[PDB]
Amino acid sequence: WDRTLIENGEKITSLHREVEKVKLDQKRLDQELDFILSQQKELEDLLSPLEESVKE
Amino acid sequence: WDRTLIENGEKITSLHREVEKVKLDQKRLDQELDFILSQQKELEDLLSPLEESV
Amino acid sequence: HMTKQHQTRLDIISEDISELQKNQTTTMAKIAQYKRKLMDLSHRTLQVLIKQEIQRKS
């Protein structure tokens, strides 16, 4: 009647933390997409010069 | 007790799978991420050498 | 008796798990975009390495 309550409160706090952690990974993951993005640009800038001196 | 205890107890288990499912879809997303950062640090390694040479 | 604030919290948790899924979808679409761009870069650098190595032999 009551023991069940105190158990759900704990169960809910577990779900709450599992969700918080997954949020953190998405945050990290988007941060990594930003890096990937600024990296593909530098890779492109780095390629044009090379593919031009050979467009013979 | 309103049987509200039943709904909560039900939601708990439901939400449980969701997260477990979601935690999995995430693990798979994180894997796609490294393979990119990997093949990409390897593309920039092949290009850095021959850049100031051409 | 906190049976009412438990259900509120479960709505909040369920509300966030939804938002999570929406994020997974979108960034799925971003990985897909970045993988396609990477294949183009990989090809082009290979060609350069090819055309460039053909230069060596002669």
From Swiss-Prot, chain A:
Role description: Essential component of the nuclear pore complex. The N-terminal is probably involved in nucleocytoplasmic transport. The C-terminal is involved in protein-protein interaction probably via coiled-coil formation, promotes its association with centrosomes and may function in anchorage of p62 to the pore complex. Plays a role in mitotic cell cycle progression by regulating centrosome segregation, centriole maturation and spindle orientation. It might be involved in protein recruitment to the centrosome after nuclear breakdown.
Part of the intact protein present: 364 to 419 of 525
What name does the UniProt record give this protein?
Nuclear pore glycoprotein p62
| PTM section of the record | The inner channel of the NPC has a different redox environment from the cytoplasm and allows the formation of interchain disulfide bonds between some nucleoporins, the significant increase of these linkages upon oxidative stress reduces the permeability of the NPC.
Gene that produces this protein:
Nup62
Query: What free text does the record give on domains?
Result: Contains FG repeats.
> What family is it from?
Belongs to the nucleoporin NSP1/NUP62 family.
UniProt source species: Rattus norvegicus
Subunit record text: Component of the p62 complex, a complex at least composed of NUP62, NUP54, and NUP58. Interacts with NUP88. Interacts with NUTF2. Interacts with HIKESHI. Interacts with OSBPL8. Interacts with CAPG. Interacts with SAS6 and TUBG1 at the centrosome. Interacts with MCM3AP.
Phosphoserine: residues bearing it: 48
Give the source's domain of life in one word: Eukaryota
Where located?
Answer: Nucleus, Nuclear pore complex; Cytoplasm, Cytoskeleton, Spindle pole; Nucleus envelope; Cytoplasm, Cytoskeleton, Microtubule organizing center, Centrosome
Swiss-Prot record, chain C:
From the Swiss-Prot or TrEMBL record, state where the protein is found: Nucleus, Nuclear pore complex; Nucleus membrane
Its PTM note reads: O-glycosylated.
Q: How does it assemble?
A: Component of the p62 complex, a complex composed of NUP62, NUP54, and the isoform p58 and isoform p45 of NUP58. Interacts with NUTF2.
Question: Which comment does the entry carry about domains?
Answer: Contains FG repeats.
The entry sums up its family as follows: Belongs to the NUP54 family.
Its function, per the record, reads: Component of the nuclear pore complex, a complex required for the trafficking across the nuclear membrane.
Official protein name in the record? Nuclear pore complex protein Nup54
Natural source organism: Rattus norvegicus
In the UniProt record, the gene name given for this protein reads Nup54
Q: Which span of the parent protein is shown here?
A: 346 to 402 of 510
